[PDB]
């Protein structure tokens, strides 16, 4: 029901512009202020902006020298964040968040009770690259007793992130999707693995759902025992 | 206007108590209600923050009684009693005393549990990759504790170096374990120059090192 779904992001060149989006459902959108918050490394959570229910007033952090612009569409239940003349400081995870609070003559005082899933923005001159996907087939050399392991290697992509699901979301137990590694090529790589009963490697079907949104690339790979 | 959390990191045992300090540069207690305008969030890895406490000490709906807020003036705390595996996360404090809301830098709670030995699995390179001229071999160490683990690669019983990479998972929300991948990368030519590909694993939970290997 109550939910915020984000889209946009990916790679962006220094000095250029990027647009982030947030679709809201399950609640009266025109009852809430809405905020945007980012999470960089070396400095964690950072509120960037909010927008009012709609006598459209907007407020921003000053460290962002007027570079960001927040807008809203009560009609389609959307919030947007535009990032302009991006710099190396802007790389990180951007969340929209439902803003709950009270306002008086002195200002607004609030709290973030519902968050979007998060989108990654990467400021880089490097070019986008979609991943190749290879199976980590279960064999006698996985096994252990009586549990088999299998997975997909997701290799040579840029930028972050990729998301991996199994059997379209219906396989989550026993799943470990590893944090990516940086390769000396400058491209990323990870593995997603899962333990299953070895007794039923014959009957059951195991499919990777790799999603590299910055390149709009989807790869489904069937992982068969070998061979 | 700073909020400084303390400590940065924290290792707490299952069933025990964690305490996370939040200091404010200035007072955050308004007159017309005599409440402190501080909040606490929980962020499990790969998830967005979840609000737990408002007004410094009021729990929010659907938050266990283990999470308790406290303090006044410029000094506040979040405690977590009877610790559970799902509490493994990063906790932030946030003030709303002015329109310019700021967060603390965050505090990670790591969890201590009993020693669990890893299950070791090994995966040869796929035929699909072997057409590309590069060959990746993966070794998986599954669901172990503690974090400290050692992996060795042996190609024809020769010890490898400068050609593998590791990634450790976040702590698991259910059993508080860790998982590890080590990926050995060679050229197709070098891969086909040798026969025995081994992954030797040393962990506290193992009486002696476990080795998994295959023949190309």
């Amino acid at each position: 029901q109550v939910q915020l779904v984000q889209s946009g992001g990916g790679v962006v060149k220094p000095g250029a512009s990027s647009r982030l989006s947030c679709a809201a459902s399950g609640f009266t959108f025109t009852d809430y202020y809405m905020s945007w918050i980012r999470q960089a490394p070396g400095k964690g959570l950072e509120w960037v902006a909010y927008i009012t229910k709609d006598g459209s007033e907007k407020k921003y952090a000053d460290s962002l020298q007027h570079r960001f612009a927040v807008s809203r569409d009560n009609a389609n239940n959307l919030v947007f964040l535009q990032l302009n003349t991006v710099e190396d400081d802007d790389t990180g995870v951007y969340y929209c968040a439902r803003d709950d609070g009270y306002y008086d003559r002195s200002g607004y005082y609030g709290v973030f009770d519902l968050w979007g899933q998060g989108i990654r923005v990467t400021v880089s001159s490097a070019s986008t690259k979609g991943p190749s996907v290879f199976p980590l087939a279960p064999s006698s050399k996985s096994t252990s007793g009586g549990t088999a392991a299998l997975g997909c290697l997701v290799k040579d992509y840029f930028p972050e992130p990729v998301t991996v699901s199994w059997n379209s979301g219906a396989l989550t137990s026993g799943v470990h999707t590893f944090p990516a590694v940086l390769q000396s090529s400058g491209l990323y790589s990870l593995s997603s693995v899962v333990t299953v009963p070895s007794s039923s490697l014959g009957t059951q079907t195991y499919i990777c759902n790799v999603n590299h949104k910055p390149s709009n690339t989807k790869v489904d790979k069937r992982v068969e025992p070998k061979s | 206007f700073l909020l400084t959390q303390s400590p940065d990191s924290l290792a707490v045992t299952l069933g025990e108590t964690a305490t996370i300090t939040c200091r404010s540069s200035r007072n955050i207690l308004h007159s017309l209600n005599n409440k402190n305008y501080l909040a606490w969030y929980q962020q499990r890895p790969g998830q967005a923050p979840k609000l737990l406490v408002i007004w410094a000490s009021m729990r929010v709906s659907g938050v266990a009684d283990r999470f308790s807020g406290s303090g006044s003036g410029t000094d506040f705390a979040l405690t977590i009693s009877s610790l559970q595996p799902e509490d493994a996360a990063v906790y932030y404090c946030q003030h709303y005393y002015t329109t310019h809301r700021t967060f603390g830098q965050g505090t990670r709670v790591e969890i201590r549990r009993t020693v669990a030995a890893p299950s070791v699995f090994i995966f040869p390179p796929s035929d699909e990759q072997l057409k590309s001229g590069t060959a990746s071999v993966v070794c998986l160490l599954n669901n172990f504790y503690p974090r400290e683990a050692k992996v060795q690669w042996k190609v024809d019983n020769a010890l490898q170096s400068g050609n593998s990479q590791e990634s450790v998972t976040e702590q698991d929300s259910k059993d508080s374990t860790y998982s590890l991948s080590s990926t050995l990368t060679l050229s197709k030519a070098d891969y086909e120059k040798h026969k025995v590909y081994a992954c030797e694993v040393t962990h506290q939970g193992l009486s002696s090192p476990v080795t998994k290997s295959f023949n190309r």
Binding site: K53, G101, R105 | -
Partner: peptide
């Protein structure tokens, strides 16, 4: 000069 973005903070501000 007095209202509520949502409810939660203003249902619990007074005491």
């Amino acid at each position: 000069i007095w209202g509520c973005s949502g409810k939660l903070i203003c249902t619990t501000a007074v005491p």
